[model samples]
Target: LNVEKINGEWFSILLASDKREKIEEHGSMRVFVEHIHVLENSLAFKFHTVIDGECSEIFLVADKTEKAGEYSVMYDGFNTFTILKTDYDNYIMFHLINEKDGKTFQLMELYGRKADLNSDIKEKFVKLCEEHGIIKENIIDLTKTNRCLKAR
Candidate 1:
């Protein structure tokens, strides 16, 4: 994959997870994506989020792994970042797994260059999420929610 193509602003479109709580209103995975910066050996993701009525920015770096389209990062748990699909100009999808306390949590996020994306892409997102065992009921549309921060 050409990592450079993904270096730009992105807006969270849809998020799905096996556990609904993770993408709900107060969910830990409800962060909004602002931008992505490509590093020599990693990728820097800038995010905006709200917690307890307070808004803030979060920066996460995902280091490149030995395998293509995969990365590793340390956060609330031992996490793996996998780029399930991306077309650079239109959209990008990620499959995330966090392992903590002997439990595994899987999530998928769909982001686009703009806040709005076409219905076709959305359908594709849902289909892919299903492949990952995340059902339609678990998918949350971020576009309906008020953004805490504006896009750059």
Candidate 2:
């Protein structure tokens, strides 16, 4: 996987096709990253995004055009982030934030091995984004994995 630094943040490219295929075969797409805390050095994070029929239907509509009627349904409350180590070797924690009723919801937490970034890995990553109908410019690199653990 290729990591690009953008706006002082590291963002990884995830292709949408791989994500859709995973959802079709496994019922979900699992992604992992390494997490680091101020006092803790290495932790693994894992999370999966499941695409049900309803979600798939909505995604199809939203994927067609950014101004599609389903755009609001897809973009309004769909946000998630995964915490990883500087090397991107291990996954520590993943937080899926859901917005509803003007409130934020922590959807799920997972624990697993760190993710590897390689050529095949990178292709899969980019494909997952394409499947999701994400534009090239919208993808961001994950530069600071430890920012969340920094002293306040």
Candidate 3:
């Protein structure tokens, strides 16, 4: 499947450190895509890369609703919807928000699945991030180590 781009709005719930702790205390947590965007230049001129031997283009838009405090903004290109559910089968979701007040926050969430170092999807994911210049500082290696998660 060629998922050229993920064009949709996703809802997110703020997971407090305490909430995360409780989840860890009890079992595990599930996270979904809160929002995704690309820099202005990237959006204006589509970025391309090869993932899993497939060529794909990525287009990202500016997240306008990002605001101060902890919150998730949903957008599906034309409309935004509240997140109804988050699937936690293999991968976890992340929410990167740049508040209107000039503050940025990164939220790391866990999906129900334990880290799988040998997942094939890692190459595609890394290529996408590299092509778009996404900062890796906030990324969590849910897959455990780089050796297991190789990039093409």
Worst 10 residues of 3 by lDDT: 76-85
Write the residue-wise lDDT of candidate 2 on 19-77 in tens digits: 23321223233221222222122122222232331112111111212322111113345
Candidate 1: where is the Cα deviation over 4 Å? none
Error of 1 at 2 (Å): 0.8
Can you give the lDDT of residue 34 in candidate 1?
92
Model 3: how far residue 148 lies from native, Å: 20
Q: Better model by TM-score, 2 or 3?
A: 3
Q: Which stretches of candidate 2 lie over 4 Å from their true place?
A: 1-97, 101-116, 143-152
Measured against the true structure, the TM-scores of the candidates, in listed sequence, are 0.94, 0.27, 0.28
Where model 3 places Cα greater than 4 Å from the true spot, the runs are 1-88, 105-112, 135-152
lDDT of 3 by residue, 1-152 (tens): 11113232322222222123322212222222333433322211122233444444434343333432222333221321122123433443333332334433323332323334233444444444344344344234433322111221
Q: Model 2 misses residue 82 by how many Å?
A: 13
| Comparing 1 and 3 on TM-score, the stronger one | 1
Q: Model 3 scores what on Cα lDDT?
A: 0.31
